[PDB]
Design a binder for this molecule. Sequence first.
Ligand code: NAD
Ligand code: NAD
Ligand code: NAD
Ligand code: NAD
Ligand code: NAD
Ligand code: NAD
Ligand code: FUM
Ligand code: FUM
Ligand code: MN
Ligand code: MN
Ligand code: MN
Lengths: 553, 553, 553
Amino acid sequence: IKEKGKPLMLNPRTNKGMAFTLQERQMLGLQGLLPPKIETQDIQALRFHRNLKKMTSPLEKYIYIMGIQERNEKLFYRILQDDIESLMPIVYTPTVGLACSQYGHIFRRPKGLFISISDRGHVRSIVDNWPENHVKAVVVTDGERILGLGDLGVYGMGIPVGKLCLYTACAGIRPDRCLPVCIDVGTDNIALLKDPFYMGLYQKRDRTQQYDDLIDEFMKAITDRYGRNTLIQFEDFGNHNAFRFLRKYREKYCTFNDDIQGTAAVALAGLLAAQKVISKPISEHKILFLGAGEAALGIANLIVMSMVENGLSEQEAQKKIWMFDKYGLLVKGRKAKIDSYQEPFTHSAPESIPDTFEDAVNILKPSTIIGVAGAGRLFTPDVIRAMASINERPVIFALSNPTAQAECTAEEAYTLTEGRCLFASGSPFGPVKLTDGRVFTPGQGNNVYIFPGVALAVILCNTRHISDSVFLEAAKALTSQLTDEELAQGRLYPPLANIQEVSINIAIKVTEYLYANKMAFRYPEPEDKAKYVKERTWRSEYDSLLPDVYEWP
Amino acid sequence: IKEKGKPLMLNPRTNKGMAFTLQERQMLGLQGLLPPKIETQDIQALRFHRNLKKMTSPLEKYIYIMGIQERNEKLFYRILQDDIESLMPIVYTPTVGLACSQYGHIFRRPKGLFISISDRGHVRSIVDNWPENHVKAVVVTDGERILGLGDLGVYGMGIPVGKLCLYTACAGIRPDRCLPVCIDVGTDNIALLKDPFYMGLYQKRDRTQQYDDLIDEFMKAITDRYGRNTLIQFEDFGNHNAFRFLRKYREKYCTFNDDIQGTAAVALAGLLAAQKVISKPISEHKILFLGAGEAALGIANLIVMSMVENGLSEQEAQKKIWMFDKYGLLVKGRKAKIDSYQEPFTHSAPESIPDTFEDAVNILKPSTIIGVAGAGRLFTPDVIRAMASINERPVIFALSNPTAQAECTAEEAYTLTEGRCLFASGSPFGPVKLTDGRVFTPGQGNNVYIFPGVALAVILCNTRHISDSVFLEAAKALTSQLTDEELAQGRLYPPLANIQEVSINIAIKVTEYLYANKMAFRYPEPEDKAKYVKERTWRSEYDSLLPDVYEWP
Amino acid sequence: IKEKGKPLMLNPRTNKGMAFTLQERQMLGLQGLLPPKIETQDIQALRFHRNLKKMTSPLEKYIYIMGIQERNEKLFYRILQDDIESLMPIVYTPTVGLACSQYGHIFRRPKGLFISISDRGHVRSIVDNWPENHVKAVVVTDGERILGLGDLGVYGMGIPVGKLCLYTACAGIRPDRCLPVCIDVGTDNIALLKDPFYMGLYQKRDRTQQYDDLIDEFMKAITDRYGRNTLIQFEDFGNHNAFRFLRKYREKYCTFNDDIQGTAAVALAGLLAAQKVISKPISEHKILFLGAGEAALGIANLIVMSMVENGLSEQEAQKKIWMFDKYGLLVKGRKAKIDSYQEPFTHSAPESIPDTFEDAVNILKPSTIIGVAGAGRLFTPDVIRAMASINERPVIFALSNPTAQAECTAEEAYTLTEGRCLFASGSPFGPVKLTDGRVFTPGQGNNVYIFPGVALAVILCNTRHISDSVFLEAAKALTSQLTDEELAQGRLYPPLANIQEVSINIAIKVTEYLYANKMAFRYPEPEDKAKYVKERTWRSEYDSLLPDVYEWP
Ligand SMILES: NC(=O)c1ccc[n+]([C@@H]2O[C@H](COP(=O)([O-])OP(=O)(O)OC[C@H]3O[C@@H](n4cnc5c(N)ncnc54)[C@H](O)[C@@H]3O)[C@@H](O)[C@H]2O)c1
Ligand SMILES: NC(=O)c1ccc[n+]([C@@H]2O[C@H](COP(=O)([O-])OP(=O)(O)OC[C@H]3O[C@@H](n4cnc5c(N)ncnc54)[C@H](O)[C@@H]3O)[C@@H](O)[C@H]2O)c1
Ligand SMILES: NC(=O)c1ccc[n+]([C@@H]2O[C@H](COP(=O)([O-])OP(=O)(O)OC[C@H]3O[C@@H](n4cnc5c(N)ncnc54)[C@H](O)[C@@H]3O)[C@@H](O)[C@H]2O)c1
Ligand SMILES: NC(=O)c1ccc[n+]([C@@H]2O[C@H](COP(=O)([O-])OP(=O)(O)OC[C@H]3O[C@@H](n4cnc5c(N)ncnc54)[C@H](O)[C@@H]3O)[C@@H](O)[C@H]2O)c1
Ligand SMILES: NC(=O)c1ccc[n+]([C@@H]2O[C@H](COP(=O)([O-])OP(=O)(O)OC[C@H]3O[C@@H](n4cnc5c(N)ncnc54)[C@H](O)[C@@H]3O)[C@@H](O)[C@H]2O)c1
Ligand SMILES: NC(=O)c1ccc[n+]([C@@H]2O[C@H](COP(=O)([O-])OP(=O)(O)OC[C@H]3O[C@@H](n4cnc5c(N)ncnc54)[C@H](O)[C@@H]3O)[C@@H](O)[C@H]2O)c1
Ligand SMILES: O=C(O)/C=C/C(=O)O
Ligand SMILES: O=C(O)/C=C/C(=O)O
Ligand SMILES: [Mn+2]
Ligand SMILES: [Mn+2]
Ligand SMILES: [Mn+2]
């Protein structure tokens, strides 16, 4: 640190509150600016939980917790670390969704970089205004597809902020090396355009070439100042833009799309886990998707790669996958458009064409149902009953977020399948107890289990580009940690309580994969990857800010 | 300002949030660090009120409001200015009392300078650590007598912080020129010495000569760095220390004790307002104090000065004042101690010595009772009834704070006297409506009506020492603003909603008084004292932070 | 010191070079940035004198020593203190005159505040850009009458810098509280307008009301930021502006013109010393001035006050003074103009009207001749012989600066008068040894013997305005320290080598004078004036920059 005095307390990155030791205060010019009391981070943590316990609504807890990030960064992450499972629902889904819809109402301090279309031609000067010098990871959004909430414009900034908190809380990626970014080119959200507290430009979305030029200028500026291997994570972009930007930049920059590729890995990881209680031939595994967008296509493509890696051919593996969107089942020659990415999963219409999703379930009789429509409770009771009849152990994945947009609840799933279903959801659901007396603990199929570990490995390996095979490897690494005892509880994923350890293990598997496949450029190559990764994870414990004082001979 | 970039946002003194104009953002390196939206202070204020409306408890609101002072100082005062009467109960008494009691539990950021006994011999170094260079006003406490709550030690820092906020919100004194100070020599509060969140030294109070040495070191260090005419306001010190320090320093430094002198002026101002409704001869005015400490003695002495000023000699005036403390009536020779300050109001034991305050009222038959004991509801229904039977319009001042320590409530006063009493309290009470339909609106006899205006005048006039006569003048300045109509509602003081205008008027009259008596050293002497003061009051509206850019011939 | 690291070395105010101790380097983040060697100031001083020894020209030395002021301020002043008499000719007259004439050619770094006519209306923002927050002394010039060199415009800035270096070297006034200022409204120096290295605006002098408006804005801005009692010393302004600005502001601000008033004091001090060897009746004291401008009038008015103080009436004392300017003797009705200040010394023509200064001497037969025309050797050998012929001990003062502009040299004065004259010069001349062996040590009648001491006293006493009597007192304080033995050598002033002590003694005397005459506002009044002044003189020895580190009981 080059600073001393009050500035050390005003910057959340360095502020320790009363945790500044006596020696640090005297040598750094803080003596007298702090109460005489010297505290430990442990005392500070207690203070937090004490106040949190008395709080009522989730949003109030969000405002309080996120506020700590702007006062004492170290304490912020220590607090999340004390109990990531109980706080995850507040800083992440579903509460982050509530925060975003009210971002302009709860605003106190801005977080991250804002680049608007009105700054076209001047994006580099904006990137140069960011205080931190060695950024290694960026999460960017334009707020067009915020969770299953739609277009929130600049209010969507809460997502990149939230995603990056997990980069640190889960994988130990250095906070000061993370940059949340919101690209504002307007919003089509009519309500927001009339909101006096809106934080973005009051115009509709610019969809012309300027939008593309802006994104291009952004990628250029970011890498020009921080380096070409700067990890850039695209998050919550509209459907059209998500795929196009991913294809356009994946070979030029170190980038990936979380909604497409991150979701694919976790969803696949769940199927690999379910495979342990079903065992049945993947040949007789019929997958039916509710929705055919970013997440569906991403999941389908990764599943295919898994089947193809296990014998089947890409052609036959795809036939085992069907999709049903807002217009119906995706079949060749249908009236609704079928894009380039969907084609491979669009088959010749069966004898009869299903009118509803329930019908598709009976006609196609799938063994697995994956919901990613962000349209609500479409995995209705009948749909679930049908699945229970058609299968002995049906796989039900209601992945849409936030909670209100989920296809169905864990409660509905288990009770309706008499406890025979294999369930996973995008948002958190507590254990379920049937009138029967059986207890089922649902897993959370959320990419939060993937992007932190993958991001860490990529950053540590100085990786230049991210292939989809990296996600295939991540999916395997996630599931390889699942213990039998946990499958028994109904868990298709490692306990969220161990997400920190699980993420580090993912990073270790990915770093070994990257090196083994000549995709890492960090030299020398470490002999022991496990030791290499663990030694470089950021800790929430306070560091000494004391200058190096020592006697000369 | 010599700072640009993020630091402008991190320092609450300069941070405007989204109110930073586009031009300021581009020229000061803030572009991109704030959302695209440019807001006005009006919008920010609306954001605040909207959120405030939804909060439940007073403590939660205190935490919210005081938190803004640490984020956007300008907005902080804007908020107070929008509705000072509704927030006064939150940032001042009684909620400020609750905040101090839990100061260590709600801690987020420190405010003020902390000087502890362990810093003996190094006080100048601590003072040199305060970031502001032109401090003009200091409010210091050792937290031994916080409101009527007793020894709160370092948790008492809430008072200096609260008083200084009022220096600005009421009198327009510049915030960056105010310095809250807490002297920590330990605490005798057993509960705090076992509180893991306590903010001070874990030791009983040091009452040896080291205490006095530390205070001496403090006075010298503050004046050494900021100037001998730096206003030093003592607040909430213990009884013994309050007087001896006032007597020891008032002729060497620009200092006064708010509890002794400020209270004196507000109470007197109330009695002076009561004469406008009583008219009764001073020869029939007999005052009886519940309590005989800092507030009681200060008030008694100022009342005497007023009487002497209007004819009576000191002796005869002092004869009209009686005191009853925790040991009973102060009569010569009583077993309980009688200090030098009390002696003038300690008379020969009456025919029968009253055992209770009720007996004292019946035996002495005062026309005015003033409560400054900070011990609770001592003005019992019987006490109030006696005053109603003895006097047609009994004067009843229950000035102890916070509300729980008040001698009685407004309801009890007006109801038990059938609307015949002239009431005033230290802490706020709403209007009282009697069964007969009459409505009485009580005034708040709290020194907040005086120290702001008095401080502004002393600072503006470069006054070197403050005499008691100054407080006599402030008292008269305060009451002269009361309007007959308001007096008719039961108001013995101008509406709290006009405290800002009232404080300025007091500042103007005190300024004219300071110059008329050759106590002001600011030269040249302003011709229009009114315009002089009004031109120098700090405003909450945002200032341009733009550099002075102009073209040359 | 709110800064640590490299900045401590880049700022000459704090830079110690290798004198930074090992602990300061470690604690302040300098370890490694300096050579491993720890030096004392003594070693640094030695390094300087060694290098200075090898240098040949005075300007080369000026560039060298003045460069040190921009690298290590403490060392700069230590160096001047090591031998002020040998370096005075380098940093002051006559070399400072050579440096101003080539200021744009030797430029490396700017020194001081520059205010031009192009900034009219924006002077306050310029004053606000000055880095130091507590300025107590300002020396300002418009460069119109630089020494006897005339209009040098912005190249004249070398003067304020010079005078201020002496404030510190002579009186121990704090460097960080001194502010050199140059007002640039153009220049009439044709040679500078065609100089590609000129440092000012390329335009003739603006003599319209805009000039006066700028000076007014400057006075207001300086006092608005630093205080109304901020000492403002006018230096080297043109003859018209000098008197009118002194008269215009002397009762509004704490200001004085060094050329008019400072010279008067030192000139009178030399005459008071001369009377220590002459003693003749003041009735037979006839004074003839070569020149009738700023210095002449100033000296004459002070000579009159001294006489009026010893008996003579104002009118009777003014009759003992004659002046001879560029147009000739000042007599009633002469063709050449005579201003208000000259009238009192413009007498009725004598028997005949002198054509040259030599004729004026033979016709008027004055006992004292004072040169202040800055026009060169006007005190010809014939003028000098005539004075020795008319008087047994002629008093000859050639005060014009620099040397080339002096009226005559010491050699010429003593040799042509056979060692019978009492000589003094504005610029330095070594001792003169006559062929008979008699040695004469000429004193330096230069206001550097006065402004340092007077400024220290005025600053220390918080004096608001400066009366001429102050300089009369300073004149006495100076000569009072002259010893007999030193008078024998031919010194009309104390040795230049003791200028530090002489200046302090003058400050002490002037301080007592200001308190005695109710002109000092610093309270309380020091009992011991000598101790008061001596305790507040800035020292050149290094101060510890270590933060206060100590153990808590
Ligand atoms: N091109 C480069 O490799 C480059 C450029 C500039 C500066 N550096 C600096 O040189 C030092 C050593 O280089 P190295 O390649 O041996 O580093 P390394 O082996 O320690 O790590 C490799 C990469 O991972 C990053 N990293 C490590 N821990 C991280 C964490 N916890 N959170 C986020 N990012 C993390 C580093 O910044 C580095 O770029 C690094 O500390 C780095 O800051 C490297
Ligand atoms: N759990 C996770 O890890 C995770 C990760 C990313 C996204 N998601 C969730 O997936 C959902 C969609 O994300 P996306 O990026 O794929 O969106 P998208 O806009 O790219 O695609 C949405 C798809 O759902 C279909 N759809 C909409 N309404 C429908 C309806 N009423 N009935 C049937 N189908 C309908 C659309 O036709 C479209 O094919 C969101 O709610 C999001 O929160 C979850
Ligand atoms: N950047 C700086 O260092 C800076 C800037 C502006 C003013 N000042 C100081 O202010 C003084 C001149 O001020 P002025 O001419 O405007 O008024 P003034 O001199 O008439 O005011 C008299 C005193 O009241 C103080 N003052 C005025 N308004 C105040 C307020 N609202 N709150 C608290 N204190 C207040 C001033 O500091 C001053 O000491 C100067 O002596 C200077 O030291 C310093
Ligand atoms: N960083 C700062 O701006 C700073 C730091 C320390 C003290 N101060 C000032 O000093 C005053 C306290 O009085 P004090 O004990 O310094 O002395 P003092 O009050 O006895 O001296 C009277 C005046 O002379 C000035 N002064 C003293 N020595 C000086 C010197 N050597 N050169 C130039 N000016 C000198 C002082 O500033 C003061 O205005 C306060 O009014 C305070 O504002 C300012
Ligand atoms: N309204 C205002 O503007 C204002 C200003 C300052 C102080 N106060 C209040 O005045 C109260 C006392 O403050 P202080 O500084 O004078 O305190 P103090 O400790 O100096 O004096 C307290 C006095 O009350 C007496 N007392 C205590 N219990 C008593 C009892 N049970 N019966 C009778 N007398 C009793 C004590 O003997 C003592 O004489 C506090 O509650 C304080 O909040 C009000
Ligand atoms: N030694 C000191 O302490 C000291 C202090 C201040 C000024 N000075 C010197 O005094 C000199 C004049 O300064 P000033 O401010 O009085 O100037 P000024 O311009 O106000 O007056 C100069 C006067 O000399 C007259 N003069 C010019 N040439 C003449 C000539 N050839 N013959 C006769 N008279 C002539 C002019 O008519 C004018 O009246 C400068 O050289 C300056 O260096 C010395
Ligand atoms: O306990 C602390 O020091 C900080 C708390 C917060 O920022 O909320
Ligand atoms: O409205 C704002 O910009 C700030 C709000 C806060 O600090 O609470
Ligand atoms: Mn997403
Ligand atoms: Mn109080
Ligand atoms: Mn000069």
